[PDB]
Amino acid sequence: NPYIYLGGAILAEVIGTTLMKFSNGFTRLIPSMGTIICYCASFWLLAQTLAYIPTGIAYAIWSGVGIVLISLLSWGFFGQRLDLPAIIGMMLICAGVLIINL
Amino acid sequence: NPYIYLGGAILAEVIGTTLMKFSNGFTRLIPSMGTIICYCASFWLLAQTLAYIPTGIAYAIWSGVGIVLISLLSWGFFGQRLDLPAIIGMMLICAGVLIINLL
Amino acid sequence: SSVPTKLEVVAATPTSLLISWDAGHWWEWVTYYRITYGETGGNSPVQEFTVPGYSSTATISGLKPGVDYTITVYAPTSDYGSPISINYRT
Amino acid sequence: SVPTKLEVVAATPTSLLISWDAGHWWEWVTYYRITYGETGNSPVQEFTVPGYSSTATISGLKPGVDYTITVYAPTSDYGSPISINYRT
Numbered sequence: 001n002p003y004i005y006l007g008g009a010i011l012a013e014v015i016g017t018t019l020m021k022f023s024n025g026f027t028r029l030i031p032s033m034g035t036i037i038c039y040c041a042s043f044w045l046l047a048q049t050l051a052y053i054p055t056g057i058a059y060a061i062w063s064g065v066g067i068v069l070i071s072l073l074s075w076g077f078f079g080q081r082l083d084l085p086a087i088i089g090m091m092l093i094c095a096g097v098l099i100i101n102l
Numbered sequence: 103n104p105y106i107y108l109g110g111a112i113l114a115e116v117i118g119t120t121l122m123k124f125s126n127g128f129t130r131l132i133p134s135m136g137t138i139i140c141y142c143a144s145f146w147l148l149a150q151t152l153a154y155i156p157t158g159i160a161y162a163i164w165s166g167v168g169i170v171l172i173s174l175l176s177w178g179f180f181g182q183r184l185d186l187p188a189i190i191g192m193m194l195i196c197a198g199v200l201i202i203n204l205l
Numbered sequence: 206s207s208v209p210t211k212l213e214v215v216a217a218t219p220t221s222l223l224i225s226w227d228a229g230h231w232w233e234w235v236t237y238y239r240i241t242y243g244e245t246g247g248n249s250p251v252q253e254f255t256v257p258g259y260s261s262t263a264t265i266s267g268l269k270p271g272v273d274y275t276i277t278v279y280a281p282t283s284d285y286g287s288p289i290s291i292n293y294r295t
Numbered sequence: 296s297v298p299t300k301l302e303v304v305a306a307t308p309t310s311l312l313i314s315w316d317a318g319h320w321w322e323w324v325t326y327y328r329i330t331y332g333e334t335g336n337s338p339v340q341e342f343t344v345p346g347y348s349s350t351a352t353i354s355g356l357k358p359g360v361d362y363t364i365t366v367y368a369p370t371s372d373y374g375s376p377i378s379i380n381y382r383t
Protein backbone atom coordinates (compact mmCIF):
# COMPACT_ATOMS: atom_id res chain seq x y z
CA ASN A 1 0.00 0.00 0.00
CA PRO A 2 2.46 2.75 1.03
CA TYR A 3 4.73 2.23 -2.00
CA ILE A 4 1.69 2.52 -4.29
CA TYR A 5 1.12 6.12 -3.17
CA LEU A 6 4.86 6.87 -3.17
CA GLY A 7 5.07 5.71 -6.78
CA GLY A 8 1.90 7.69 -7.40
CA ALA A 9 3.61 10.80 -6.06
CA ILE A 10 6.58 9.93 -8.28
CA LEU A 11 4.29 9.92 -11.32
CA ALA A 12 2.71 13.18 -10.10
CA GLU A 13 5.95 15.16 -9.79
CA VAL A 14 7.16 13.89 -13.16
CA ILE A 15 3.95 14.98 -14.90
CA GLY A 16 4.18 18.36 -13.16
CA THR A 17 7.76 19.02 -14.27
CA THR A 18 6.92 17.99 -17.85
CA LEU A 19 3.89 20.28 -17.99
CA MET A 20 6.15 23.03 -16.61
CA LYS A 21 8.56 22.49 -19.51
CA PHE A 22 5.60 22.60 -21.92
CA SER A 23 4.21 25.87 -20.56
CA ASN A 24 6.32 28.99 -20.25
CA GLY A 25 7.08 30.85 -17.03
CA PHE A 26 3.62 30.44 -15.44
CA THR A 27 1.92 31.30 -18.73
CA ARG A 28 0.13 28.59 -20.74
CA LEU A 29 -3.09 28.42 -18.75
CA ILE A 30 -4.02 24.78 -19.38
CA PRO A 31 -0.61 23.26 -18.48
CA SER A 32 0.06 25.98 -15.87
CA MET A 33 -3.10 24.98 -14.01
CA GLY A 34 -1.95 21.42 -14.68
CA THR A 35 1.31 22.15 -12.86
CA ILE A 36 -0.40 23.73 -9.84
CA ILE A 37 -2.79 20.77 -9.61
CA CYS A 38 0.01 18.21 -10.02
CA TYR A 39 2.11 19.93 -7.32
CA CYS A 40 -0.57 20.54 -4.68
CA ALA A 41 -1.54 16.87 -5.11
CA SER A 42 2.00 15.49 -4.99
CA PHE A 43 2.73 17.60 -1.92
CA TRP A 44 -0.47 16.29 -0.33
CA LEU A 45 0.65 12.79 -1.38
CA LEU A 46 4.13 13.11 0.10
CA ALA A 47 2.65 14.63 3.27
CA GLN A 48 0.60 11.44 3.70
CA THR A 49 3.05 8.77 2.48
CA LEU A 50 5.90 10.00 4.72
CA ALA A 51 4.13 9.22 8.01
CA TYR A 52 4.00 5.55 6.97
CA ILE A 53 7.42 4.62 5.52
CA PRO A 54 10.57 6.21 7.00
CA THR A 55 11.23 9.66 5.59
CA GLY A 56 14.72 8.86 4.29
CA ILE A 57 13.39 5.73 2.59
CA ALA A 58 10.70 7.50 0.57
CA TYR A 59 13.28 10.21 -0.17
CA ALA A 60 15.57 7.70 -1.87
CA ILE A 61 12.86 5.76 -3.72
CA TRP A 62 11.44 9.04 -5.04
CA SER A 63 14.84 10.44 -6.00
CA GLY A 64 15.36 7.13 -7.80
CA VAL A 65 12.11 6.41 -9.63
CA GLY A 66 11.96 10.18 -10.20
CA ILE A 67 14.89 10.39 -12.61
CA VAL A 68 14.19 6.80 -13.72
CA LEU A 69 10.69 7.70 -14.89
CA ILE A 70 11.80 11.17 -16.06
CA SER A 71 14.38 9.62 -18.37
CA LEU A 72 12.05 6.68 -19.10
CA LEU A 73 9.49 8.91 -20.82
CA SER A 74 12.32 11.08 -22.17
CA TRP A 75 13.20 8.49 -24.83
CA GLY A 76 9.44 8.21 -25.40
CA PHE A 77 8.88 11.90 -26.15
CA PHE A 78 12.00 13.42 -27.74
CA GLY A 79 13.92 10.32 -28.78
CA GLN A 80 16.44 11.30 -26.08
CA ARG A 81 20.14 10.44 -26.54
CA LEU A 82 21.86 8.25 -23.95
CA ASP A 83 22.73 4.55 -23.77
CA LEU A 84 24.21 1.82 -21.58
CA PRO A 85 25.02 3.92 -18.45
CA ALA A 86 21.42 5.13 -18.33
CA ILE A 87 19.69 1.77 -18.80
CA ILE A 88 21.84 -0.31 -16.42
CA GLY A 89 21.85 2.49 -13.86
CA MET A 90 18.05 2.47 -14.06
CA MET A 91 17.98 -1.22 -13.15
CA LEU A 92 20.55 -0.42 -10.44
CA ILE A 93 18.29 1.96 -8.51
CA CYS A 94 15.35 -0.27 -9.51
CA ALA A 95 17.16 -3.12 -7.76
CA GLY A 96 17.83 -0.73 -4.88
CA VAL A 97 14.07 -0.18 -4.76
CA LEU A 98 13.44 -3.91 -4.31
CA ILE A 99 15.56 -4.00 -1.12
CA ILE A 100 13.78 -0.94 0.31
CA ASN A 101 10.33 -2.05 -0.92
CA LEU A 102 8.41 -5.22 0.01
CA ASN B 103 28.80 30.79 -2.72
CA PRO B 104 28.34 29.14 -6.18
CA TYR B 105 27.78 25.60 -4.92
CA ILE B 106 26.88 26.77 -1.41
CA TYR B 107 23.88 28.39 -3.11
CA LEU B 108 23.00 24.96 -4.54
CA GLY B 109 23.62 23.56 -1.06
CA GLY B 110 21.03 26.06 0.15
CA ALA B 111 18.25 24.43 -1.88
CA ILE B 112 19.17 20.89 -0.86
CA LEU B 113 19.22 21.92 2.80
CA ALA B 114 16.05 24.04 2.65
CA GLU B 115 14.28 20.99 1.27
CA VAL B 116 15.92 18.72 3.84
CA ILE B 117 14.32 20.96 6.48
CA GLY B 118 10.92 21.22 4.80
CA THR B 119 10.56 17.45 4.45
CA THR B 120 11.11 16.89 8.18
CA LEU B 121 8.66 19.74 8.81
CA MET B 122 6.15 18.03 6.52
CA LYS B 123 6.03 15.15 9.01
CA PHE B 124 4.84 17.73 11.55
CA SER B 125 2.42 19.25 9.02
CA ASN B 126 0.09 16.29 9.70
CA GLY B 127 -1.29 16.18 6.17
CA PHE B 128 -1.33 19.99 5.81
CA THR B 129 -3.74 20.15 8.77
CA ARG B 130 -1.37 21.62 11.38
CA LEU B 131 -0.62 25.31 10.92
CA ILE B 132 3.05 26.40 11.31
CA PRO B 133 4.44 23.09 9.92
CA SER B 134 1.92 23.13 7.05
CA MET B 135 2.86 26.75 6.37
CA GLY B 136 6.48 25.94 7.19
CA THR B 137 6.83 23.19 4.59
CA ILE B 138 5.40 25.43 1.85
CA ILE B 139 7.77 28.22 2.95
CA CYS B 140 10.84 25.95 2.92
CA TYR B 141 10.05 24.68 -0.60
CA CYS B 142 9.48 28.09 -2.22
CA ALA B 143 12.90 29.15 -0.93
CA SER B 144 14.30 25.99 -2.51
CA PHE B 145 12.40 26.92 -5.68
CA TRP B 146 13.73 30.51 -5.66
CA LEU B 147 17.48 29.90 -5.45
CA LEU B 148 17.36 26.68 -7.51
CA ALA B 149 16.50 28.94 -10.44
CA GLN B 150 19.40 31.18 -9.38
CA THR B 151 22.02 28.41 -9.12
CA LEU B 152 20.85 26.67 -12.31
CA ALA B 153 21.95 29.72 -14.32
CA TYR B 154 25.62 28.75 -13.92
CA ILE B 155 25.61 25.21 -12.45
CA PRO B 156 24.55 22.44 -14.90
CA THR B 157 21.99 19.71 -14.20
CA GLY B 158 23.40 16.24 -13.46
CA ILE B 159 25.41 17.81 -10.64
CA ALA B 160 22.30 19.21 -8.93
CA TYR B 161 20.24 15.99 -8.82
CA ALA B 162 23.23 13.82 -7.90
CA ILE B 163 24.04 16.19 -5.02
CA TRP B 164 20.35 16.26 -4.06
CA SER B 165 20.05 12.46 -3.89
CA GLY B 166 23.23 11.96 -1.87
CA VAL B 167 22.73 14.72 0.69
CA GLY B 168 18.97 14.22 0.92
CA ILE B 169 19.28 10.46 1.34
CA VAL B 170 21.84 11.31 4.06
CA LEU B 171 20.69 14.59 5.61
CA ILE B 172 16.98 13.82 6.10
CA SER B 173 17.56 10.17 6.98
CA LEU B 174 19.92 11.30 9.72
CA LEU B 175 17.34 14.00 10.50
CA SER B 176 14.60 11.35 10.74
CA TRP B 177 16.89 9.22 12.95
CA GLY B 178 16.96 12.16 15.38
CA PHE B 179 13.72 14.10 14.96
CA PHE B 180 11.48 11.02 15.09
CA GLY B 181 13.16 7.63 14.85
CA GLN B 182 12.80 4.70 12.45
CA ARG B 183 10.07 2.43 11.09
CA LEU B 184 11.79 0.25 8.43
CA ASP B 185 9.58 -2.25 6.56
CA LEU B 186 12.41 -4.01 4.63
CA PRO B 187 15.98 -5.00 5.63
CA ALA B 188 18.69 -3.49 3.41
CA ILE B 189 19.70 0.07 4.24
CA ILE B 190 22.35 -0.08 1.49
CA GLY B 191 19.50 0.14 -1.05
CA MET B 192 19.33 3.93 -0.71
CA MET B 193 23.04 4.17 -1.51
CA LEU B 194 22.59 1.78 -4.45
CA ILE B 195 19.46 3.64 -5.52
CA CYS B 196 21.68 6.72 -5.43
CA ALA B 197 24.40 4.75 -7.23
CA GLY B 198 21.89 3.93 -9.95
CA VAL B 199 21.08 7.65 -10.00
CA LEU B 200 24.76 8.62 -10.08
CA ILE B 201 25.46 6.38 -13.10
CA ILE B 202 22.46 7.61 -15.09
CA ASN B 203 23.17 11.32 -14.55
CA LEU B 204 26.97 11.56 -14.46
CA LEU B 205 27.38 8.56 -16.78
CA SER C 206 -5.37 20.33 26.71
CA SER C 207 -7.70 20.20 23.68
CA VAL C 208 -8.11 22.70 20.84
CA PRO C 209 -10.14 24.73 20.23
CA THR C 210 -11.14 26.12 23.63
CA LYS C 211 -13.60 28.71 24.93
CA LEU C 212 -16.30 29.13 22.26
CA GLU C 213 -18.30 32.30 22.89
CA VAL C 214 -20.75 34.54 21.04
CA VAL C 215 -19.19 37.99 20.85
CA ALA C 216 -21.92 39.93 19.05
CA ALA C 217 -25.53 38.85 18.55
CA THR C 218 -28.17 39.88 15.99
CA PRO C 219 -31.58 38.39 15.09
CA THR C 220 -30.14 37.21 11.74
CA SER C 221 -26.39 36.96 12.47
CA LEU C 222 -23.91 35.86 15.14
CA LEU C 223 -20.26 36.77 15.71
CA ILE C 224 -18.30 34.08 17.54
CA SER C 225 -14.69 33.37 18.46
CA TRP C 226 -12.57 30.70 20.12
CA ASP C 227 -9.14 30.14 21.65
CA ALA C 228 -6.95 28.60 18.95
CA GLY C 229 -4.46 27.58 21.64
CA HIS C 230 -0.72 27.86 21.36
CA TRP C 231 1.15 28.39 18.09
CA TRP C 232 1.83 24.66 17.79
CA GLU C 233 -1.88 24.08 18.44
CA TRP C 234 -2.90 26.27 15.48
CA VAL C 235 -4.42 24.46 12.50
CA THR C 236 -4.83 25.15 8.78
CA TYR C 237 -8.63 25.28 8.45
CA TYR C 238 -11.41 25.13 11.03
CA ARG C 239 -14.74 23.97 9.62
CA ILE C 240 -17.75 25.38 11.47
CA THR C 241 -21.30 24.00 11.48
CA TYR C 242 -24.57 25.60 12.58
CA GLY C 243 -28.21 24.58 12.58
CA GLU C 244 -31.48 24.55 14.45
CA THR C 245 -31.76 23.20 17.98
CA GLY C 246 -35.02 21.41 17.17
CA GLY C 247 -33.38 19.11 14.63
CA ASN C 248 -36.01 19.19 11.85
CA SER C 249 -33.25 19.95 9.33
CA PRO C 250 -29.68 18.95 8.47
CA VAL C 251 -26.65 21.16 9.19
CA GLN C 252 -25.07 24.02 7.24
CA GLU C 253 -21.28 23.88 6.95
CA PHE C 254 -18.58 26.29 5.85
CA THR C 255 -14.83 26.30 6.35
CA VAL C 256 -12.57 29.14 7.46
CA PRO C 257 -8.75 29.34 7.36
CA GLY C 258 -7.02 28.17 10.52
CA TYR C 259 -5.10 31.37 11.24
CA SER C 260 -8.32 33.24 12.16
CA SER C 261 -10.05 32.76 15.51
CA THR C 262 -13.28 34.62 14.67
CA ALA C 263 -16.20 33.72 12.44
CA THR C 264 -19.38 35.49 11.34
CA ILE C 265 -22.60 33.67 10.45
CA SER C 266 -25.44 35.22 8.44
CA GLY C 267 -28.93 34.32 7.30
CA LEU C 268 -30.45 33.15 10.59
CA LYS C 269 -34.08 33.34 11.63
CA PRO C 270 -34.82 35.42 14.74
CA GLY C 271 -36.24 34.01 17.95
CA VAL C 272 -35.20 30.42 17.19
CA ASP C 273 -32.67 28.70 19.42
CA TYR C 274 -29.61 27.54 17.46
CA THR C 275 -26.65 25.23 18.07
CA ILE C 276 -23.14 26.12 16.85
CA THR C 277 -20.21 23.69 16.63
CA VAL C 278 -16.61 24.45 15.61
CA TYR C 279 -14.56 21.56 14.22
CA ALA C 280 -10.89 21.13 13.21
CA PRO C 281 -9.26 20.15 9.88
CA THR C 282 -9.46 16.63 11.30
CA SER C 283 -11.76 15.57 14.15
CA ASP C 284 -10.49 12.20 15.42
CA TYR C 285 -7.29 13.83 16.73
CA GLY C 286 -8.63 16.66 18.93
CA SER C 287 -11.89 17.69 20.58
CA PRO C 288 -14.58 20.12 19.31
CA ILE C 289 -16.84 22.59 21.17
CA SER C 290 -20.57 23.22 20.72
CA ILE C 291 -22.72 25.97 22.24
CA ASN C 292 -26.25 27.34 21.98
CA TYR C 293 -27.75 30.77 21.40
CA ARG C 294 -31.31 32.11 21.09
CA THR C 295 -31.45 35.09 18.72
CA SER D 296 0.48 36.17 -32.57
CA VAL D 297 -1.52 34.42 -29.82
CA PRO D 298 -3.66 37.44 -28.81
CA THR D 299 -5.80 37.80 -31.95
CA LYS D 300 -9.30 38.68 -33.22
CA LEU D 301 -9.70 42.00 -31.40
CA GLU D 302 -12.85 44.01 -32.11
CA VAL D 303 -15.50 45.98 -30.22
CA VAL D 304 -18.84 44.17 -30.04
CA ALA D 305 -21.18 46.55 -28.20
CA ALA D 306 -20.47 50.27 -27.89
CA THR D 307 -22.19 52.66 -25.48
CA PRO D 308 -21.08 56.33 -25.30
CA THR D 309 -19.59 55.54 -21.87
CA SER D 310 -18.54 51.87 -22.13
CA LEU D 311 -16.96 49.41 -24.57
CA LEU D 312 -17.35 45.63 -24.75
CA ILE D 313 -14.22 44.00 -26.22
CA SER D 314 -13.26 40.43 -27.09
CA TRP D 315 -10.39 38.44 -28.56
CA ASP D 316 -9.34 34.92 -29.48
CA ALA D 317 -7.59 33.51 -26.41
CA GLY D 318 -5.69 31.13 -28.70
CA HIS D 319 -6.78 27.50 -28.44
CA TRP D 320 -6.50 25.32 -25.31
CA TRP D 321 -2.81 24.37 -25.50
CA GLU D 322 -2.01 27.96 -26.48
CA TRP D 323 -4.43 29.30 -23.85
CA VAL D 324 -2.53 31.72 -21.62
CA THR D 325 -2.93 32.53 -17.93
CA TYR D 326 -4.20 36.10 -18.25
CA TYR D 327 -4.60 39.03 -20.61
CA ARG D 328 -4.02 42.55 -19.32
CA ILE D 329 -6.13 45.28 -20.94
CA THR D 330 -4.88 48.86 -21.22
CA TYR D 331 -7.28 51.65 -22.18
CA GLY D 332 -6.68 55.40 -22.17
CA GLU D 333 -7.36 58.57 -24.12
CA THR D 334 -6.04 58.75 -27.68
CA GLY D 335 -2.34 61.04 -24.61
CA ASN D 336 -3.38 64.10 -22.61
CA SER D 337 -5.20 62.09 -19.94
CA PRO D 338 -3.65 59.12 -18.09
CA VAL D 339 -4.07 55.54 -19.28
CA GLN D 340 -5.95 52.83 -17.37
CA GLU D 341 -5.15 49.14 -16.96
CA PHE D 342 -6.68 45.94 -15.61
CA THR D 343 -6.28 42.18 -16.10
CA VAL D 344 -8.61 39.35 -17.12
CA PRO D 345 -8.11 35.57 -16.73
CA GLY D 346 -6.82 33.86 -19.85
CA TYR D 347 -9.64 31.36 -20.26
CA SER D 348 -11.93 34.39 -20.61
CA SER D 349 -11.97 35.74 -24.17
CA THR D 350 -14.06 38.83 -23.34
CA ALA D 351 -13.90 41.81 -20.99
CA THR D 352 -15.81 44.99 -20.22
CA ILE D 353 -14.46 48.56 -20.00
CA SER D 354 -16.59 51.02 -18.03
CA GLY D 355 -16.30 54.69 -17.12
CA LEU D 356 -15.43 56.46 -20.37
CA LYS D 357 -16.22 59.95 -21.52
CA PRO D 358 -18.66 60.25 -24.44
CA GLY D 359 -17.34 61.26 -27.85
CA VAL D 360 -13.71 60.90 -26.80
CA ASP D 361 -11.58 58.61 -28.95
CA TYR D 362 -9.77 55.93 -26.96
CA THR D 363 -6.95 53.44 -27.52
CA ILE D 364 -7.23 49.90 -26.13
CA THR D 365 -4.38 47.38 -25.88
CA VAL D 366 -4.55 43.72 -24.79
CA TYR D 367 -1.25 42.21 -23.65
CA ALA D 368 -0.23 38.58 -23.22
CA PRO D 369 0.46 37.43 -19.64
CA THR D 370 4.16 37.32 -20.58
CA SER D 371 5.56 38.34 -23.97
CA ASP D 372 6.70 35.47 -26.21
CA TYR D 373 3.16 35.08 -27.59
CA GLY D 374 3.47 37.89 -30.15
CA SER D 375 3.13 41.64 -30.30
CA PRO D 376 0.25 43.13 -28.28
CA ILE D 377 -2.78 43.94 -30.43
CA SER D 378 -4.22 47.47 -30.21
CA ILE D 379 -6.98 49.35 -32.02
CA ASN D 380 -8.96 52.60 -31.92
CA TYR D 381 -12.63 53.43 -31.41
CA ARG D 382 -14.80 56.51 -30.96
CA THR D 383 -17.76 56.18 -28.60
Ligand SMILES: C[N+](C)(C)Cc1ccccc1
Nearest residue numbers: 013059062063066115141
Ligand atom coordinates in the same frame (compact mmCIF):
# COMPACT_ATOMS: atom_id res chain seq x y z
C1 LIG E 1 10.15 19.59 -4.17
N1 LIG E 1 11.18 18.69 -4.80
C2 LIG E 1 11.74 19.36 -6.01
C3 LIG E 1 12.31 18.49 -3.83
C4 LIG E 1 10.53 17.37 -5.20
C5 LIG E 1 11.33 16.13 -4.88
C6 LIG E 1 12.33 15.70 -5.74
C7 LIG E 1 13.01 14.51 -5.49
C8 LIG E 1 12.69 13.76 -4.39
C9 LIG E 1 11.70 14.17 -3.53
C10 LIG E 1 11.02 15.36 -3.78
